[PDB]
Symmetry: D2
Subunit: 139 residues, 4 copies
């Protein structure tokens, strides 16, 4: 759909109805150590002033780092959810696309950490996200 990891037979919310499907996030590559995703800029991703909403970068990074963790851990009986999301903004984006690259830097038993880079169509670094993902056994 958004090309999210297929790890379960049923999902509570269909992609098109989720926040992710509504703004248009799509996973591109995915491996245990690195994943990418992107989104086309539309007014649905912007704030009233015409720039891509800061929350959009946050959300792309959160989905990308978390889903990339899920991809590995789901099949191991674990649940993966974001515990901390620290996004820093360097340059705005008015149009085009937002591309994210998440690089795994730590995979502990209870926490995985990913560095996410958010770039524009020109390849410029527009924002970064330090994603801390909690890993716990499913209930």
């Amino acid at each position: 759909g958004g090309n999210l990891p297929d790890v379960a037979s049923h999902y509570p919310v269909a992609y098109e109805q989720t926040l992710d499907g509504t703004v248009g996030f799509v996973i591109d590559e995915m491996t245990p150590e690195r994943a990418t995703a992107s989104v086309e800029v539309t007014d649905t991703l912007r704030q009233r002033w015409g720039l891509v909403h800061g929350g959009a970068y946050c959300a792309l990074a959160e989905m990308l780092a978390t889903e990339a963790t899920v991809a590995v851990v789901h099949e191991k009986g674990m649940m993966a959810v974001g515990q901390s999301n620290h996004t820093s903004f360097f340059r705005p984006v008015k149009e085009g696309h937002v591309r994210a690259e998440a690089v795994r830097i730590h995979a502990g038993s209870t926490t995985w950490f990913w560095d996410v880079s958010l770039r524009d169509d020109a390849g410029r670094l527009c924002a970064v996200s330090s994603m801390s993902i909690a890993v716990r056994p499913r209930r």
Copy 2:
């Protein structure tokens, strides 16, 4: 005023209902120079595939609230305000109801304002917090 955001301009590039904010339904309640509140009714549009409120939704609500709260004061002074850092920490998920946010200003420097935002559930539990650092600069 579509989601009750501060009327500081005659015109805006994107209408409320078309923005991310309008799409997910964020609405500002109170707004003062030192404190602001807003909320959103949870619907699937606010959730991730697993059925919970998306982490990014809390980050966005906090971001919009703190920034707009800064804009309410500085716009007229000829400044622009945009977030420079958003650090959101998640304590408990939200599956349904509303997400209620309260932003309290803790520092108002000449170049940066800082707000502590608490995000609660209908039962009043602290579900997430966001430390928002807002850059303040003069418009071009």
Copy 3:
């Protein structure tokens, strides 16, 4: 010594030899939900430019939030260590004292979170720290 919680019979490093005792951190009050500490500014707390080192605020906050967690959890078979320390600086300090107040905002099963405020002798907010403390069973 530094008035740290007395929870064990032996400690690997004596207060006076630790980083805390070397810069002079002292716990004032301590309860499960709130704790305070302070330090006199000396050159040992400063950087070459004469201001209190940013790392000093970080360290005060980290010791204070962690030790306050230890105070409750130690006796329960758990270990408490900092997992994330996010310190933001609003105003420098050149002399006097640094006073910290840590307020517990979340006490989960595996994570405790504290908001730490760092003030000067005039009571001004000089910095803040969001301390995320991991709680795990002792080995």
Copy 4:
């Protein structure tokens, strides 16, 4: 040059050996506009009562490194540089040896520089990371 910090001034308010940096023994190794390294030998002065390197020690090493690395370039340009945000995340403790830090510049704006700092052990493992946001302003 006491701990090999950038010589950008004739005189400094506090001598190396007297500062926090000198007391704990931080030493700068390489230093360029886009990348800097430093290290410290672990001793009790770097530890907490439980025998591990104090979290605050990593935060301080990262802080000093990123800031001084910014100072090396901007001082001569009449700017002052001070950290505005230090976010350090801890992955694995260090009990002894050294702590080695590498700061990589990722953004150099007109008012903020941002450095990613990695803190490793003697075995090269990633023990902590720090996101350092440095404010750049003109001196008074």
